[PDB]
Structure formats: structure tokens, C-alpha cells
From a paper:
Each monomer consists of three extended α-helices connected by loops, featuring a characteristic kink in α2 (residues 160–170) induced by the conserved Pro167. This dimerization buries an extensive interface of ∼2700 Å2. The interface can be broadly divided into two distinct regions: interface 1, on the convex surface, involves antiparallel α3 helices, whereas interface 2, on the concave surface, comprises antiparallel α1 helices. The analysis reveals a distinct charge distribution: the concave surface is predominantly positively charged, whereas the convex surface exhibits a negative charge. The most intense positive potential is located centrally, contributed by positively charged residues (R108, K109, R112, R114, and K116) from the dimer-forming α1 helices (denoted as region 1). In line with our aforementioned analysis, mutating the residues in region 1 (R108, K109, R112, R114, and K116) reduced the amount of copelleted protein by approximately 90% compared with WT, underscoring the critical role of this central region in lipid binding. Mutating L120 to the negatively charged glutamic acid, together with I257 to the polar glutamine, abolished dimer formation, as shown by SEC–MALS analysis.
FAM92A (family with sequence similarity 92A), a classical BAR protein, regulates ciliary assembly, mitochondrial ultrastructure, and neuronal membrane dynamics, yet its molecular mechanisms remain elusive. FAM92A (also known as BARMR1 or CIBAR1), first cloned from human testis, is a gene encoding a BAR domain–containing protein and belongs to the FAM92 (family with sequence similarity 92) family alongside FAM92B (CIBAR2). Mouse FAM92A possesses a central BAR domain (amino acids 70–283) flanked by unstructured regions at both the N and C termini. In ciliogenesis, FAM92A plays a critical role through its interaction with Chibby1 (CBY1).
Numbering used by the authors:
A (entry chain A), B (entry chain A): 2 to 214
Amino acid sequence: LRRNLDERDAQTKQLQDAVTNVEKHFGELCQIFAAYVRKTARLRDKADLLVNEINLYASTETPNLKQGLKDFADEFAKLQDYRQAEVERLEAKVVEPLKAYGTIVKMKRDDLKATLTARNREAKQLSQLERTRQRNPSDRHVISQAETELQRATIDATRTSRHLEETIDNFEKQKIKDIKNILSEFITIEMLFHGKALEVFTAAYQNIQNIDE
Amino acid sequence: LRRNLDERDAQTKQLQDAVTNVEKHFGELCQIFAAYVRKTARLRDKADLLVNEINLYASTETPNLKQGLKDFADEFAKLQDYRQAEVERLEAKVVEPLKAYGTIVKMKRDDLKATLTARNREAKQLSQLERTRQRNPSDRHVISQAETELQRATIDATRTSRHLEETIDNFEKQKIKDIKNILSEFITIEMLFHGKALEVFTAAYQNIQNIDE
């Protein structure tokens, strides 16, 4: 029935738009997290430049001031190693899992296309059956054959749509697990870095106090 | 005496090179700290983009997942306000004090130039005195006048050099205080930010756990 076909299509469009919504927003988050990683690395570069200049300036100075400056530079350089570990973990645990949704989305689009193909085959077999009844009204045999082929197309379309509903449902379940895990990893990777920074800067504060002024 | 003038000049050259060494290295540190600040701000920009996308994606989602995402975005946005305070303090307490050494260096160069000028005047008055003795060997009056003017130039050069030694000595004392204070401020400003980040990310870890998966 026509009012049922409008409903059936609108419901598949929702599954289609559900895949698109994730493709769009996980993909945007993926680009932003990659840019966040690049900006973290570019900040590490400037911190390296500071380490080098403090060391070079320290090499020109009186002994106690030189030692205090080198000790600071040694601690701060340690912080940039932790920043490098933060960059690598963010690439592996945040950017790469979001990037993998390109392939997940492609597989869902195949399931959606198979459903559209099966429904076109069904609609074609239904129009075939009505035409065959009209051209050969009294040929029970060829009508029965067209009825049998419609029933095959119908159950194949139902089963293809039934599989689609299951894979999209699993896709939504895994979407929630993934976004929880991806943001959790981002939070713990950052927390690890900020905790190490506090350790480093606490010690660096001592090495500056020992500079005899 | 000539061996004394080589010594006297080499010692003023050391004062001159001491001003240059600070000009060069405080100026390099100033440029690097400014670039470090710009890279911190550019990392804040990317974090803002993450806040916006998480909010926009959350506006499309089921109620519990939407709320969990918005709560994360609200906490992380709080972290970028602390990053903005870190940027402002680094500009005011680290970059600006290093930048102020352009003016300090200029004043020391004036003291150095006054010393060179006074020594040229002295050397000229000494050559004048020897010439006057040679052209008027028996004019005790004009010789005595040239001797008196040499003694004025000599004590003026001694006093100008004596003032130079005092201002460079004070300049070295203040250099050590300043570099200790500037690096201490950098360390405490960073420590403050990393401590606030730990607070924010600890709370953000809860808001992610409440997402029903």
C-alpha cells in the first residue's frame, strides 16, 4: 500500500541519514583532533628552541648562573619528551580511531544500496506481475510463475532490509562505545601529560631558586 | 703607559661585550617566548574548534549522549579560559620584561659612549700638551695651562669610567635577578595552568563515564 511505502522509505532514509550524521561529525572531529595534534607538536618545537637558547646563553655565563640555567633547560627538555609521547598517543588513540569510520561508513552504505536494489527488483516484479495478468488473463501457468517470482523478490527485500536494520543498530551501539572510548582516551592522555608537566615544573622551580642572585 | 692602555681598553671591551651578550641572548629569549605564546594561543584556537564541533554534534544526538557530550564540551571550554589567562600572564610577566632590555641596553651604551668620548678628549689633550711643550719650550704659562687642561680631562675620564663600572655592575646584578624572576614566573604560570587542566580533565572524565553505552 502506498501509505506504507512512504513510511518504509522515510524509515530507510532515517538509517541513511544516521550513517551520514556520523560520517559528517566523526569526520569533522577527526580533522580537528589532527589539527590539535599538529598545534601541540608546533608548540613542542618552540619549547625546543627555548631549551637550545637557554643552553647556549648558559654556556656564556658565570658558573652558578650557568649551572642553574642548564638545570632548568634539562628539566624543560624532559617535558618536551612527554609532549612527544602525548602527540603519539593522540594520533594512535584519538585521530586514528575516528579516521577508521570512513571504512565503517562505506560498509553501511553498501548495506543501504543492497536494500535499495532489492526494493527496485521487487517493484519491477510487481509491475511485471500486473502486466502479465493483463496480457494473459487466462494463462494460469505464466501468472503463477510471475506470482512466485514476486514472492521471491519480496522475501529477499524483507531479508535485505532486516539485515540493514541489524547492522545499523550495531553501528549505533558501536558508535556510542567508540565516542566514549575516544574522548576518554583523549582525556587520560592529556591528564597524563599535565601530571608529568606539574612534576617537571615543580623540580624546575628548585633549580631556579639555587641561582645565587 | 702603552701596556696600561691596552689593558684599560680590553677591560672596557669586556663591559661592552657584557652588554652585547645580554642584548643578544635576552632578545633571542624574548622572540622565542613570544612565539611560544603565539603557539599556545593557536592551540587554544583548535581546542575552541573542538568545543564547537562537540556541541554541534551533540545537538543531533539522543538525550543521554547529547548531555554527556555537552558536559564534556563545557568543561573543556573552561580549560581554554585558563589557557587564555596563561597567555596573558606569559605576555605580561615573561615576554614584556625581556623586551624591556632594549631600553636598558641603550642606556648602558650611552654610558659606554661617554667613556669613549672622555678618553678621546684626554688623549687629544695629552697630544696637545706635548705639542705645546715642543712649540713653546720656555713659555711656562701656556705649558701650565695645557697641563691643567690635561688634568681636567684625565679626572673627567676616570670619573666617567668609574661611573660606567658602577652601572655595568648594577646591570649584571639586575640581570641575574631578572632572569631568575622571569624564568620563575614562566614556571609558576605554567604550573598554574597544568594544575587547572588536571582539575578540568578529572571532572571531564566523569561526564564521559555517565554516557550510557
